[PDB]
Amino acid sequence: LSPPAFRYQLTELARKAGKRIVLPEGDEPRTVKAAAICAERGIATCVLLGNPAEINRVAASQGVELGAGIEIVDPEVVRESYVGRLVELRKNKGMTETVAREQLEDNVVLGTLMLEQDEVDGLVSGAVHTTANTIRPPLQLIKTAPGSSLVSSVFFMLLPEQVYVYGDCAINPDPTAEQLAEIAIQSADSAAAFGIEPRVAMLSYSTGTSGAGSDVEKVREATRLAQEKRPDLMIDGPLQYDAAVMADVAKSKAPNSPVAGRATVFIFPDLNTGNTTYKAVQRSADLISIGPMLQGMRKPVNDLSRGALVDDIVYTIALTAIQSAQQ
Amino acid sequence: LSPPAFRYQLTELARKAGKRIVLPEGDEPRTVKAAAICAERGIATCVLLGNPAEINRVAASQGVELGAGIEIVDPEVVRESYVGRLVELRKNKGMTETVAREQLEDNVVLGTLMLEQDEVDGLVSGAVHTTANTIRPPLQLIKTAPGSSLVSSVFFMLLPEQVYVYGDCAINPDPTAEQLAEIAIQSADSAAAFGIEPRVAMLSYSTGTSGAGSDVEKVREATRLAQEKRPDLMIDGPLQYDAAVMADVAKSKAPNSPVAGRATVFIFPDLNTGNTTYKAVQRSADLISIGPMLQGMRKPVNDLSRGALVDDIVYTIALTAIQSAQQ
Ligand SMILES: [Cl-]
Ligand SMILES: [Cl-]
Ligand SMILES: [K+]
Ligand SMILES: [K+]
Ligand code: NA
Ligand code: NA
Structure with a gap:
């Protein structure tokens, strides 16, 4: 694509x-x-x-x-x-x-x-x-739509040969664990509706248990909550960004992960993280973005x-x- | 460089x-x-x-x-x-x-x-x-060193023709406003000691008042506190990442800024933001990093x-x- x-x-x-x-x-x-x-x-x-x-x-x-x-x-x-x-x-x-x-x-x-x-x-x-x-x-x-308690957003990241989905990089400043799981599910449904197989990486500064703290546990909670509501979706977390996109890093830090190394949907823990990474990647890879697109309405x-x-x-x-x- | x-x-x-x-x-x-x-x-x-x-x-x-x-x-x-x-x-x-x-x-x-x-x-x-x-x-x-109440860290980001300084992308999960100002000052002193003119961008999802919330105010507090202790240093914030590196974005969203458009030191609001952006930029621009280097000891x-x-x-x-x- x-x-x-x-x-x-x-x-x-x-x-x-x-x-x-x-x-x-x-x-x-x-x-x-x-x-x-x-x-x-x-x-x-x-x-x-x-x-x-x-x-x-x-x-x-x-x-x-x-x-x-x-x-x-x-x-x-x-x-x-x-x-x-x-x-x-x-x-x-x-x-x-x-x-x-x-x-x-x-x-x-x-x-x-x-x-x-x-x-x-x-x-x-x-x-x-x-x-x-x-x-x-x-x-x-x-x-909001049924099953949604909030509105979030995603960016379509147009790489040379594939499309990634980033969110939420515009709307929700500090999602709770429950809200973050909801953002992940909304973003995966958006991805599938636009022809993108959703493999959802719940991003953190920790890969698995490489780091500890309340920030890491929120992503871990949101991962489990999202898997509870949608057992059909491929979600995993917490994952650092390199573990989500690189198969070599995935094989070393998260080898049992069905998402690590081939993520297509990237769920950021907060707006600080999402917007900063979105803006930095747009400049560093010099790729093209479409969005933001609202979801949950x-x-x-x-x-x-x-x-x-x-x-x-x-x-x-x-x-x-x-x-x-x-x- | x-x-x-x-x-x-x-x-x-x-x-x-x-x-x-x-x-x-x-x-x-x-x-x-x-x-x-x-x-x-x-x-x-x-x-x-x-x-x-x-x-x-x-x-x-x-x-x-x-x-x-x-x-x-x-x-x-x-x-x-x-x-x-x-x-x-x-x-x-x-x-x-x-x-x-x-x-x-x-x-x-x-x-x-x-x-x-x-x-x-x-x-x-x-x-x-x-x-x-x-x-x-x-x-x-x-x-810790005199004047430092904590230890932080920086990465040297080796671009094709210049070196950026990122921090703190490894150590401190959730710095307070006071700690974040301290991280910014430590990182600028590190930059100058390694031959890098420090122009410090305090990063946020908001450029100036483009966004509001407790997360934005922390960066605003840390910016003012760091400017108080070090009036000689070029610090500005809050700034989105694109405003920090692009002169065109700087001229439109922060034209009175002495840092926007030409930042060399990038201070992330938390570890979620710093580590995720650090990992993403390493893959997207395919550049080279040196670090992390401790500071404040x-x-x-x-x-x-x-x-x-x-x-x-x-x-x-x-x-x-x-x-x-x-x-
Ligand atoms: Cl885990
Ligand atoms: Cl301001
Ligand atoms: K508008
Ligand atoms: K070690
Ligand atoms: Na990639
Ligand atoms: Na740049």
Whole structure:
């Protein structure tokens, strides 16, 4: 699975999904250009939230036509029709009609209510907003998937001939043992859904009992808890990074391990570890990453980097559509 | 500073130091062969602790002569002469003459007492023993250097044209803010002593205020505390790894930073982060590392990997001799 091969696999899987993805940042130039690519290539039907005139002016300003597969929704027209639904959804938290109308001025809230009404299949935003702005309404309204008590994330690491899965390198600062086992299971399910055989390495500064301490025991607990809920999955830990990827190190420090030496899914003990290793490997191996992709949400939601490129948005919409077919 | 250039710089600095390094594993084949190289190249005078006949048989078994610069000490001859000193050193902890004699059967204890008696300048062991076996007697008897409340460690990361310093990637599992500031200062002093201009990046999953949480505040506290004790040092944090090494990321996320974009010393928030990133970078960039090197000890002590090679031992003796001239 080379980087071009994996990127095409995302295109193939998204086409077979045949999903509708709402884009709250409907008039954003990068998002308009990416939506037209997804429609022309069959990656997804893109629902743009914004003024039809402005979106078409932005589309014309970038040499892009919005034909089939592009559906523009004017928030001013449809906003009031979702007020009653939002009041009903948050009535026990003190939602009023006036407050609900105030919240619906944000296109992410509007797209989330469209997502909750099963009018679209997924939501992508964040090119010109914060991560919290993208995920807070879905967290409040869509909630977590059954069997998940939290949302985590993964990065797809595109090596020259294979794809690794890293997580959680963006969201959860300090997972407990129970949460870490949940992150490992979510990440392995994500890997399998995107064509990656999950061999899950629970990372630590200790390989087995080479090191001791509360930090090592948390990874050991999470390993056992994850194996309890999913006896079918190949999980092992604790493992240092070299033991997870090198067969020679595996044969010397963890020879009875079904994961060591050939791990494909790498679960980091905390965000310090995950984000630092993710950033360092991106520079040192000079490889390519796709993500981060959220996991554990009841319906797919994903947040873009504020400096994302058009192609970054294109494949993020693909991931979101593929996640919709997974559920 | 290419890897060959840096390795020669260690040779030059060790020669100028002109130190004596005691080797408790005196009859170990790899250690005997490395000691003769250090003596012939002028890296250090090596004091081998073992049976003179056995050491010479091991030396002859590897095509190696032990001439000038090699001094063999028979533990059976000199052990009793250090019993009274050990009793005096640990009298308040319940040391007796019989217990002291029992402890002196371990050559590391004997070499540590030689180190404490200023008969040698540094100690290297661990090729056939655990790390705890190497460092416990010095920790009990030599103690920490003035201004240091703990011992930490660094790895020298030999990039194609420069050398980075990583720490602490081996010893301290979860440093407090005060300890982390101490690790940063020790690591910068180590870097400068080995010909590396210290620009210290205090690593985190947050660049500045990009992320919040107790983990980020610890790095922020350690950054300020380290700057308080050493106003002359270039320290900054918190910084993600990409902000520390990439000028473009630095100009966008930390433009007022005197370290971001050109860091040479990388201080990891905990052992999970340090060891995982160290192991991952070694595989991803396929670079070369030297270490780990202890720091903060009153007199230099260093521990070998049990799978170390002869050349690994050679340059570890060099590091230890260089550390002796630093103090
Ligand atoms: Cl274990
Ligand atoms: Cl800050
Ligand atoms: K964002
Ligand atoms: K050792
Ligand atoms: Na690898
Ligand atoms: Na670099």
